């Protein structure tokens, strides 16, 4: 009738001879159908022989049906040993602290062993959450042959593949601690990796050697940071300073719940599993404990117990395990090595979600560096140079200074405003000047000219203006996305091959464009006859080209579409208009120069479409681009 | 002064202990006794693991052993009965050397990091098979493994051998141990073309394997069997098929030869070791020492590199895992239901004994070794048509406009007719089908076609984890292998292209727009550029066009307007314009122009943009595609395609309306 179970628990260490005996086991939750019978024993230092002998010794005829192990020790190995006994006995064993809690090789399925440490997979997940929180995207992994490797590599792989972010795995390293090195082979590899954020995985002892070697390699310093699983930190009571400071790692907290509370959790799990198994089969779990002889009969039946024991709940708290035998989601704390020897908590993490305390710059501008000088040119419609009021002595309002080597000129306009907003958003400061040789870039024989030259000579980082886009310049320098719809176009008063030959039409026809332009170069590339014919009709400047159109002596003019459209809108009389719908061939937009694959690059691009994203460009279009003509619409 | 350096061992019998001590004394006598001396300690196997582990900690380690030797017990209990020692010594990093454990699970340094052996594991036997496979030139085989660290390790090793070559997974077959009936799996095996088989399993499992295999007559000629030492032995030998090829490791049974040699190696290793300084004795006794032994890994390092090629057992060198290298096996044949040595294998090269080769069934010499294409499609009106087979009766005699009977084939595909969606037997006839059969007459292959469950051809989606999802649709079936080859109207693009090989285009076409004639300037239409809620422009989400919209940055803004009011399938998309629900429709021409002819109420406009081609999908690994393109071109030159488009594009009634 009265179903009293038989249980045993052990504490090692506790920094005391006369370690606190039988603090717990006091009746709690007595309602549970089986009452616990407890025998407590302690042993001072761990050994395979001492532990094996003692646990079997307690087994005797005693017939205990469960065991909880706890330690003051930092030792990795212990868990496996007790697990081995479990494999032999089929008697459940679990552990609440230290090494037993420390991770171990994948448990034999038949075997029953449990740990109150977190799952390897779970820990890797937390490491990832930590990196994501500080937005450290790029990282590498240093590992050792110790068990759980490739369960870890796989877990990281799974966790990483799913996320949207463009994180980079740089290197994965597997080094055998066995075949210990004269070669400093670990030094020879570790020296290779350039990545800022490093995940390390190994035994507590191994971390020391890897770290001394890293200290030789120079990997512990200045901008690189290391992140660690439970095992290395272990107890956290003892910390060789061979570990670098700023080392980041997760562990279970002593403060939240003390060790006896944890032991209470273990006992509760064992007796709850006993109660549930009872409820299911009304059967006593009690079994003969003696290891030396063959395992007791009907102990083979015990498998279901494991099946029952995996998830257990008491005190409104879930003990649920995972197939490996780690608890599914124990509460966990993000810890850092405070300066000196301190292990001081940084974060709390539970279940699905994680929370961390410090805001910024955890543990000459930190975000970014250097300065950028910019070159431009004055557009007859866009980029406007104005002469500053001499009495004032310096630029006014929207006008931003630009210098031309030959005198301070004051630039304002579309490029100035777009640049200004961009500078405001990305938050950098810049120097603006004017180009001298060749304006927009021009090729004579082998060599480039213009702002592009100053971009190539590194006398300019980025070139801004009415500059059009083409394959050659995109080849030499990265370009910003087009902000405006533009291109080649025609402007006249009011593919047919009428352009292709003038001579087909008996009266001489006339059309021309500005030389050294992207338009003229494109023309020469695709259509030769047009270029060779139009060289006579080429004009000095857009105002003068306009003089050729306006006063007569020229029929048609060809130029950039944005300028021709703005000029369409703005004219002293509506004497000038675009061609057709002004729908332009060679559909292009104004870009912006950068050096090469290395540049702020994408950061710029985002800024640009944010400008349209808030609808500013429409306003700026109405103010700067909009002309009065095209009034009859 | 002399220093007594202990060694320890666990062996089968006291006689073998005496053999051990004798070998040790031979080591002492033949190397300097003035500087150092070796001492021997040993114990018989104990009934459980625990008595033995206790023996190591008490009886052996109290003697300060620098290393331990272990052998399999007289009656094997379960398997890997020398499991505990590798763990027990391992705590202190004391090197362990097994004599009789051919078990593979000790090869992983991670779990057993102190473990070395004078014999190669069963996995390493694959070295022979690759060499065997090498000689006979069969690249195509089948592998049957039990499911455990043993079988999976064998698979990994052989596959790793194959990795240097183009990776060859002709097929692989996993079964789980203790299963008396394996019939279904072999039924799956026969379908695979490759006629050569290799297997690894336990004796009891092997009985079941041969028992099941004989039922399906896979033991017959034209089939070859390659196997592990365990398979030929025991009860498995009794039920074993004739002509099988088999392996036996040399001196595998003998502990003693391996004893003399192992101890010889240990001696050489130690004498080489003490040449080094900063040495420490192993921990005295298990009790009171929680710490490892710093020397132990070094002792392992020298011992793994320890040469001494001359030995009673054969050449000695150790692989990275501590497993032995360059071991010798003796190949065995089943002739007249008895074991015979056809040849013997030593070193990296096989050796052929004078005995005649036997193959299964009757062969004086018979080295013989080594079809069905699963095809998938989608419902696209011009190149594919779907009608169910009338009752049981198959296909209609319906005739093309040019007098020819229409060809047809059976296809299993999604049906929306039933409220639930069953994969339904159907009749499908098409341009792509005529092409496929044209190939089938040209090509050695035979074809069975079923339409993909998803109406979509394919697009990347979902999340990710162990069982990655992958792009939904027929393409996904291709990577999955549900269909080995894809015949459909598929546009060819780089994003897909990296994943799979693409056949040369049968057709050349580009995207365009359908709008009703009866009262869009360009691919770039200001009207598109000037979108309107009032003027719709419609497409199919997950259609490749959508991939063009998402992947391309330059038009990336324009994508979203199209995204609104998307249709699920082609018929509905054409219908909307026909129903006048949607003013415009955007799709690739090859599907669209045929419809343009079909109604003429609707028209195509502008210039094909996103100019592309349609091609037949295959995995890069499959060489048949090499012929396919080669065939496709051959079909282009003669004008076969021109006449097929001429047949299936009617062109009957329509014109430029204006």
Curated annotation (Swiss-Prot), chain A:
The keyword Transcription does not apply. GO terms for molecular function: metal ion binding; NMDA glutamate receptor activity; transmitter-gated monoatomic ion channel activity involved in regulation of postsynaptic membrane potential. Zn(2+) binds at residues 97, 254. The keyword rRNA-binding does not apply. Its main location: membrane. Belongs to the glutamate-gated ion channel (TC 1.A.10.1) family. NR2B/GRIN2B subfamily. Heterotetramer. Forms heterotetrameric channels composed of two GluN1/zeta subunits (GRIN1), and two identical GluN2/epsilon subunits (GRIN2A, GRIN2B, GRIN2C or GRIN2D) or GluN3 subunits (GRIN3A or GRIN3B) (in vitro). In vivo, the subunit composition may depend on the expression levels of the different subunits. This is Glutamate receptor ionotropic, NMDA 2B. It comes from Xenopus laevis. The gene is grin2b. The chain holds residues 26 to 802 of 1448 of the full protein.
Curated annotation (Swiss-Prot), chain B:
Its main location: membrane. Gene3D superfamilies: 3.40.50.2300, Periplasmic binding protein-like II. Glycans are attached at residues 39, 181, 254, 278, 328, 346, 415, 444, 464, 627. Residues 1-519, 520-658 are extracellular. The keyword Signal applies. It is found in: Cell membrane; Postsynaptic cell membrane; Postsynaptic density membrane; Synaptic cell membrane. InterPro entries: ANF_lig-bd_rcpt (IPR001828), Glu/Gly-bd (IPR019594), Iono_Glu_rcpt_met (IPR001508), Ionotropic_Glu_rcpt (IPR015683), Iontro_rcpt_C (IPR001320), NMDA1-like_ligand-bd (IPR049872), NMDA1-like_N (IPR049873), Peripla_BP_I (IPR028082). It is a multi-pass membrane protein. Disulfide bonds join 57-286, 395-427, 411-428, 600-654. NMDA glutamate receptor activity is modulated by zinc ions. The NMDA glutamate receptor activity of the heterotetramer with grin2b is stimulated by micromolar levels of Zn(2+). The NMDA glutamate receptor activity of the heterotetramer with grin2a is inhibited by nanomolar levels of Zn(2+). The keyword DNA-binding does not apply. Glycine binds at residues 489, 491, 496, 544, 588. GO terms for molecular function: glutamate-gated calcium ion channel activity; ligand-gated sodium channel activity; metal ion binding; NMDA glutamate receptor activity; signaling receptor activity. Pfam families: ANF_receptor (PF01094), Lig_chan (PF00060), Lig_chan-Glu_bd (PF10613). SMART domains: Lig_chan-Glu_bd (SM00918), PBPe (SM00079). It catalyses: Ca(2+)(in) = Ca(2+)(out); Na(+)(in) = Na(+)(out); K(+)(in) = K(+)(out). One of its GO terms (biological process) is regulation of synaptic plasticity. Component of N-methyl-D-aspartate (NMDA) receptors (NMDARs) that function as heterotetrameric, ligand-gated cation channels with high calcium permeability and voltage-dependent block by Mg(2+). NMDARs participate in synaptic plasticity. Channel activation requires binding of the neurotransmitter L-glutamate to the GluN2 subunit, glycine binding to the GluN1 subunit, plus membrane depolarization to eliminate channel inhibition by Mg(2+). NMDARs mediate simultaneously the potasium efflux and the influx of calcium and sodium. Belongs to the glutamate-gated ion channel (TC 1.A.10.1) family. NR1/GRIN1 subfamily. Heterotetramer; the NMDAR subunits are modular and harbor tiered domains that function in concert to regulate opening and closing of the cation-selective ion channel pore. Forms heterotetrameric channels composed of two GluN1/zeta subunits (GRIN1), and two identical GluN2/epsilon subunits (GRIN2A, GRIN2B, GRIN2C or GRIN2D) or GluN3 subunits (GRIN3A or GRIN3B) (in vitro). Does not form functional channels by itself. This is Glutamate receptor ionotropic, NMDA 1. The lineage of its organism: Eukaryota, Metazoa, Chordata, Craniata, Vertebrata. The gene is grin1.
